[PDB]
């Protein structure tokens, strides 16, 4: 079709101040700072208005599958406002039958060392993407918590535990064993 | 004398088609920094059609047979080779006015390099379509000189940012030196006929 432009706007609260180098978006907030580069996506980024700080991403002309990519800009941008003002927290619990799944943390949250996964002698040292850290939970059994500012660094690192506790050569309809995520929340709440 | 073509940002066959016509016509052409040549289509596709080229091999001995070069200076050289009549002596000499290099050698790091707008990626690809670098499709297939080339380029490019430091030091000076006085009589006739 090659339509005349589309645009989404992003309402930005005051405790986060966004600058842009170009198609790079620099997001600074209370609990740190994080940046992305969108130099592959062929759009313009214009932050408009004083005192209100609106961010309008608009793509002129464009094909239908390049109309689908202006919404992907503003959704990654809102997850940078959210992550730098509230953080991300993925709570994962250990689902197991007869064998308990023992889990510790070796180095400062950066290493999770899983052992006794379904009676096995082989350890599973899962290192994490830099920026996230772990915690054994309190007032709940067998739970692990992951906290950080970037959702792609929390969730990919959450997938490295869930992929490591994988049952081979067996039925996975029974033998439900592993450390699966349970909740998708934030570090600071109710804001 | 010789045109010096900086190879990066160019496409493989659009650049090689212009060189293979300028070199039958009697010019000397030096293509420099072939590591940065783009090639259209995504990287996995261009890496497949070079691995399909590698299995082309004469059965009875591979020592005689197709010589699969691995440096991007020679990948680009064999692309120009296939656009020249290289089995005649009018085409043997045509391959010999082409000195294609890799990185930028010490004769050629201090010459002004030209580009070809007829073969640049920005001009000739539509930007929503993918491309492959010739640097890492060489590296994925058998080339062992990527890191020792990038080390020498960032030492080469650092010796030129101090050259361009002091080149625009002179340009700031001679723009303030032309501020002064009494050359207005000569600017009467140059502004009149395109300063």
């Amino acid at each position: 079709m090659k339509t005349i432009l589309s645009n989404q706007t992003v309402d930005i609260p005051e405790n986060v101040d966004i600058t842009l180098k170009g198609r790079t978006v620099i997001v600074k907030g209370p609990r740190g700072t994080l940046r992305r580069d969108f130099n592959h996506i062929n759009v313009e980024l214009s932050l408009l208005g004083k005192k209100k700080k609106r961010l309008r991403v608009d793509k002129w002309w464009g094909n239908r599958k390049e109309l689908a990519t202006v919404r992907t800009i503003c959704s990654h941008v809102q997850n940078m406002i959210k992550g730098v003002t509230l953080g991300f927290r993925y709570k994962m619990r250990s689902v197991y039958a007869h064998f308990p799944i023992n889990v510790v943390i070796q180095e400062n949250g950066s290493l999770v060392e899983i052992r006794n996964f379904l009676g096995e002698k082989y350890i599973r040292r899962v290192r994490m993407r830099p920026g996230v850290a772990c915690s054994v939970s309190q007032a709940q059994k067998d739970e692990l918590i992951l906290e950080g500012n970037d959702i792609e660094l929390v969730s990919n690192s959450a997938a490295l535990i869930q992929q490591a506790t994988t049952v081979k050569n067996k039925d996975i309809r029974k033998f439900l064993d592993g450390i699966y995520v349970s909740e998708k929340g934030t570090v600071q709440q109710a804001d | 004398q010789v045109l010096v073509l900086d190879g990066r940002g160019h496409l493989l066959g659009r650049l090689a088609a212009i060189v293979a016509k300028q070199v039958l016509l009697g010019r000397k052409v030096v293509v420099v920094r072939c590591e940065g040549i783009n090639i259209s289509g995504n990287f996995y596709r261009n890496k497949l059609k070079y691995l399909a080229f590698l299995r082309k091999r004469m059965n009875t001995n591979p020592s005689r047979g197709p010589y699969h070069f691995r440096a991007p200076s020679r990948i680009f050289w064999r692309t120009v080779r296939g656009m020249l009549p290289h089995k005649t002596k009018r085409g043997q000499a045509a391959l010999d006015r082409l000195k294609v290099f890799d990185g930028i050698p010490p004769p050629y790091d201090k010459k002004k390099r030209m580009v070809v707008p007829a073969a640049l990626k920005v001009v000739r690809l539509k930007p929503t379509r993918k491309f492959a670098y010739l640097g890492r499709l060489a590296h994925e297939v058998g080339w062992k000189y990527q890191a020792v080339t990038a080390t020498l380029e960032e030492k080469r490019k650092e010796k030129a940012k101090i050259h361009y430091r002091k080149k625009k030091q002179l340009m700031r000076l001679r723009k303030q030196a032309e501020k002064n006085v009494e050359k207005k009589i000569d600017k009467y006739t140059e502004v009149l006929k395109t300063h």
């Binding site: - | 009875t60 001995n61 020792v148």
Partner: protein, 348 residues
Amino acid sequence: SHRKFSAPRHGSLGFLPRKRSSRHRGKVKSFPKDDPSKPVHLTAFLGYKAGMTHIVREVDRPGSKVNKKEVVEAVTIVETPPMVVVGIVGYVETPRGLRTFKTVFAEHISDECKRRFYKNWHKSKKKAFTKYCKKWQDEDGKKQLEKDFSSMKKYCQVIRVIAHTQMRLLPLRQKKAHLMEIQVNGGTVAEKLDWARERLEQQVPVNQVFGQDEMIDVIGVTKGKGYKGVTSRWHTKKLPRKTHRGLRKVACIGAWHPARVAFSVARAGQKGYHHRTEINKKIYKIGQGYLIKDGKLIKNNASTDYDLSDKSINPLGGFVHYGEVTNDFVMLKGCVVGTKKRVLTLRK
């Protein structure tokens, strides 16, 4: 079409030009790649095999049936007198490979280096390096010889050491030293180059380079067997007795339609005398040989803690075809590439 019975290829195609090697001394194709976090050391060393014996040892190995029992092992021994450092080479990394930057040879060079630089030491005037030694002593050459070290330190990044053997300490006939060129893998290239300026024209023993119960490589040229047939060079099966015109031949050497014999088929030619690398040879003992005359000649080799007898490792009657080992040695578990009296290069 389709042999009816599977069978694998005879011989390996990874050693395929079964050729007389172009070198008698084994060439290190690859030294160990370093990081500068290690202390400064050598990596390779020349040696001459004398022959083999065997051994008895109390092998500790839990799990096995070999545990806490005496087990014999074939051992070769290699006579290694100390090397003597002559040269320093510098290699600068390029986008075409390593390239020799320049070399600096020692202030005064031995008799047996200089014999390696000739094809007829008898007819020669013995004139090699005679004008090169006079740039160590003149004032103008000396300031631009130590400038070639300061330019070596600036640009080139891997440096090597030219060292030769002392053939005078050996029972052989040869008296030409073998001149090797071995890589130092220390820390920075300033400390790596100052460690060799310190120690030109000086001896480097074999215990300073290698250690006991440490595992190395052996590089050399094999026993030469000559021009041998298909069934001995390639271990092809003999044909039956009834075969006209010959037993020890390969019968079919190709199909019709590739109308051309392949490299992958077996046919007769030179067997043996090939350049090979054995990997993972353990050192059993570093020897020390025929020391000071205060006690007139302490032989004392092969005298273990459980032996306590005045023995020496050279066998009763001498090493066959070799001579009599008066120098340091390294003994290696198992078989080792080469004839007796052959230069083989040990390498970490």
